[PDB]
Amino acid sequence: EGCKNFFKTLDARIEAVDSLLTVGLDPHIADLPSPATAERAFVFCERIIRETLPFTCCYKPNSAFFEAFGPPGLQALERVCALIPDDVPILLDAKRGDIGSTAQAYASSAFDAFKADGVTVNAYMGREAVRPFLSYRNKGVFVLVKTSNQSSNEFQTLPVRQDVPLYVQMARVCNELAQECVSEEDSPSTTGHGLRHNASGGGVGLVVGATDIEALREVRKACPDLYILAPGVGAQGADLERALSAGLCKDGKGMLIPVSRGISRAENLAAQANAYREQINEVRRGIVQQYE
Template sequence: MSFFEKLTQRAHDVNSLLCVGLDPHKAELEEDSAEAAFKFCQRLIEETKDLVAAYKPNAAFFEAYGVEGWAALQRTLAAIPEEIPIVLDAKRGDIGSTSEAYASSAFQTLKCDSVTVSPYLGGDGLQPFLKDPSRGVWVLCKTSNPGSQDIQALQLPSGEPLYVHVAKVCCLQWAKEHSNAGLVVGATDVEAMRVIREAVPEPCHGGPSACESNSPASQHCHSSRKNRPTIILEHHTGLSKQEPCNP
């Protein structure tokens, strides 16, 4: 089963479009350690595992703890039930040979179902991720931060913003063979979402394309096409600050 089939199946099974971010910020941990980062994620997984369509661990917060952090990431991934798809948020992407190593790390070593990547090294830089039809590849298109205007929104001679070109080239060319890519589009920019959906009317993947945001409501939404599910992503900061439910 491919990543997007797994995601579609899971969203259907739990009737949920929620993807929970696992971002163990130091400020939220009981102590500043890799063990505390793991415990933070473990608790979040325990509290939400019946409700979620996917989990999105952000590698940076684990890598910050060095070798112990890497082990904490592996333990966190192992704590996620098998049937729940994983989006490794690592925002990889380099020249082809280096991307081969990144892809091997995400898919073979960490055994994640999908990974976030940057498109700015071009198609050859993403092929190592895209060549495996069983894995999902989330390409940054229009991100949620204010600085996304600096480069992603630059106007091309054709009149379209660069992020629209990214959406088109990714969906219609780079990921055409296996339709295994999604687009990360910030829900902070509703207009960008509209323009992208217009520019790429057909799905470029077997499931939803992604959107992220830092909205005050702590929600990220993923746009959908046709009968594919729309994924709603919830910030970890929105969920992790909730009190545990008492039975």
């Protein structure tokens, strides 16, 4: 079964280990034994995977930290991705964004070379920057909508042309794009969250910071079915219970909570991972119970 994908594999993994926890694989030089190397970055990511695997539904390595070591850093990235099991999606956080010809090469890099199951994308340049990634029909493509940082309140929150914030228009385009890539499948869906993904387990995802509760509420309203990657928990001190409440779908899914330092710096990685997992699960229980 070399038919590993993003969303279908994800859903099974989520139900199998009961988790929406995504674990970031970010080898910051400062967190590695001195003197830092690409090899040490590999070991760092290995131990993390080895210990948090039972509580994790998805691994999110961030390309920048590997790129910091040059070619040996990417050599480490490839080895890290190859280390992750076939039943656990790999979301490559590279926030790539360029024109057609060029985006096709970033897509191939992420999927053919690094062998990721999903990838992060920047759509400032419009849909021509997202489609090339979606041609790989079984892959997850997560578009940056409203980010977790402070400066997101500089362009992303600008009123656009009753006016809507730029990030909202971005979400509407993403939803329209999701609908465009599932246009030939029997509609309406027979399971419900039909735009969540396509028959191959591929589809459009959204990146919305957990830090901004309003944004999650607005994005969810524009894109009711799509998955949302919500960075912010731990490091940026985001309110986890309030975030899930705003972004989770009726079925208690449709949202991924990525944590990096929150886990990697912990005395016990495995115990910490589970702590977030359980914490997340307390909220999911409520959401799913209200509608039964």
